[PDB]
Amino acid sequence: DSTECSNLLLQYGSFCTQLNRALTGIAVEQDKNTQEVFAQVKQIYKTPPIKDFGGFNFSQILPDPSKPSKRSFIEDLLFNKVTLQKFNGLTVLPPLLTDEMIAQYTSALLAGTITSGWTFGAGPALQIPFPMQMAYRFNGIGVTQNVLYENQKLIANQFNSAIGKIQDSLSSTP
Amino acid sequence: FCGKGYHLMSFPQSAPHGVVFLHVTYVPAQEKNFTTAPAICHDGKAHFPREGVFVSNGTHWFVTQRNFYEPQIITTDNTFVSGNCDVVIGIVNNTVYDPLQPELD
Amino acid sequence: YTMSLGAENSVAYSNNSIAIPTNFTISVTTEILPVSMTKTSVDCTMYICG
Numbered sequence: 001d002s003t004e005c006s007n008l009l010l011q012y013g014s015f016c017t018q019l020n021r022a023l024t025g026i027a028v029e030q031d032k033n034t035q036e037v038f039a040q041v042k043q044i045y046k047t048p049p050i051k052d053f054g055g056f057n058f059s060q061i062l063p064d065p066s067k068p069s070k071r072s073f074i075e076d077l078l079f080n081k082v083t084l085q086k087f088n089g090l091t092v093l094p095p096l097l098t099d100e101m102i103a104q105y106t107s108a109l110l111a112g113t114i115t116s117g118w119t120f121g122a123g124p125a126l127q128i129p130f131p132m133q134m135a136y137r138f139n140g141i142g143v144t145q146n147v148l149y150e151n152q153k154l155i156a157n158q159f160n161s162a163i164g165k166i167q168d169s170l171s172s173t174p
Numbered sequence: 175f176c177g178k179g180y181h182l183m184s185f186p187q188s189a190p191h192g193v194v195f196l197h198v199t200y201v202p203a204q205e206k207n208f209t210t211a212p213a214i215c216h217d218g219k220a221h222f223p224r225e226g227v228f229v230s231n232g233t234h235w236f237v238t239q240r241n242f243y244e245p246q247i248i249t250t251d252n253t254f255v256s257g258n259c260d261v262v263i264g265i266v267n268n269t270v271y272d273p274l275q276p277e278l279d
Numbered sequence: 280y281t282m283s284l285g286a287e288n289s290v291a292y293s294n295n296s297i298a299i300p301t302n303f304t305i306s307v308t309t310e311i312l313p314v315s316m317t318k319t320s321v322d323c324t325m326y327i328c329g
Contacts, residue, residue: 043288052294054263104284115292122179123201126298127290131264132212132227136240145222146256149212152263177308192313199308202300210297227297243301264295 031096038097038105045112045125054131055156058114060163063107069100072107077170180241202241211235211266214248220262221253221270228266235268247271 009016047062063070071079079099085092097105116125117133131152135145148155176184177197185196208229214221226239228248236245237252246252249271259265291298 039284041285043285046287046289048289048292054294101282101284108285112290115290119202120290124203124205124298124300125288125290126202126205126300127292128297129210129264129292129294131294132210132297135212144254144256145212146220146262149220149222149262150257177306177310179306182305189311191315191317192311195310195312197308197310199306201304201306202302203304204302205298205300207291208297208299209295211295227299229297229299238299241300242303243299 027093034095034097034102038102038109041105041108041112041120043125044104044108045115045120046108047111047114053114054129054134055153055160056130056134057156057160057163058110060167061110063103069103070107071103074167074170075103075106077167081170206243212264213262214253214270215259215265215267216270218259219255220257220259220265221248221250221255224252224254226252235266249273 047058051058051062060073063072064076067073067076112120112125114130115127117128117136119126119128131148134152134155135148138148139145175181176195177199179199179201182198182200184198187194187196209232210230211228212222214228214235223237226237229236229238229245231245235248237248238245248268251273253270
């Protein structure tokens with residue numbers, strides 16, 4: 001707010017418009033970055049209220065309808081670990097996608113891969129029982145279906161325990 | 175990577191200072207609900223499909239490929255047998271046709 | 280207004296239900312990628328002094 005300074009600044013031409021154009025250019029692509037990572041679903045897919053997935057327990061990755069933004073348990077654990085203005089010219093512009101909408105994106109991406117599998121990324125979302133989804137994903141790595149079906153209860157317990165340890169390794173390890 | 179759906183093939187087209195790819199993809203459509211089972215019980219043995227899923231039109235059980243509805247009768251050639259019929263949960267009782275018995279008689 | 284993230288959809292999931300396509304559509308979609316920009320050069324001495 002110094003007029004004798006701002007008049008002198010015009011003598012340098014168009015540095016000020018270049019700098020603002022560059023910062024606006026890298027502020028728009030910060031929203032493009034989030035859009036191309038999360039906005040990959042045509043529709044908001046939902047999880048069945050009754051959660052019978054053959055023994056698999058996605059309680060710590062699925063949303064909780066009591067928590068802020070209905071964040072999942074691991075998502076809430078993640079938002080409490082990172083938490084560690086305007087004076088003269090500096091102005092932080094808010095992100096276009098609020099954390100609630102990014103959480104809805106990750107809930108839809110996660111509820112479509114549980115119910116429909118990998119089909120909702122290639123067309124119409126086709127439902128399939130989760131145990132049978134695991135069987136065909138076992139086929140993908142070279143193991144036959146019967147290895148999943150005859151060890152289903154062991155496999156579900158291992159998966160649930162592994163999710164539980166992700167929760168612990170995040171809740172404690174700084 | 176190359177377009178939405180299952181990639182079939184792509185065609186390049188030159189552009190002033192870039193390239194335009196024409197991604198030809200396969201998009202499934204016109205789906206139908208069905209009933210499935212992990213495996214078929216026959217003679218105290220469990221039968222799993224070699225390549226496909228077990229589906230039923232409400233009355234009869236079929237073996238179809240997983241991306242296109244082409245039901246076929248459950249024979250011992252498009253299934254394989256592994257284990258007894260009490261460990262897989264979701265087994266359904268049904269007949270597995272054999273292409274050797276009819277000729278023998 | 281507040282953005283709608285998309286149309287709500289619930290997949291009819293159950294422990295013994297599948298959906299299998301009966302037809303298909305062959306779709307062709309474009310994707311444009313820049314590969315090069317204009318080969319320019321400036322004479323530092325001529326630009327500055329002239």
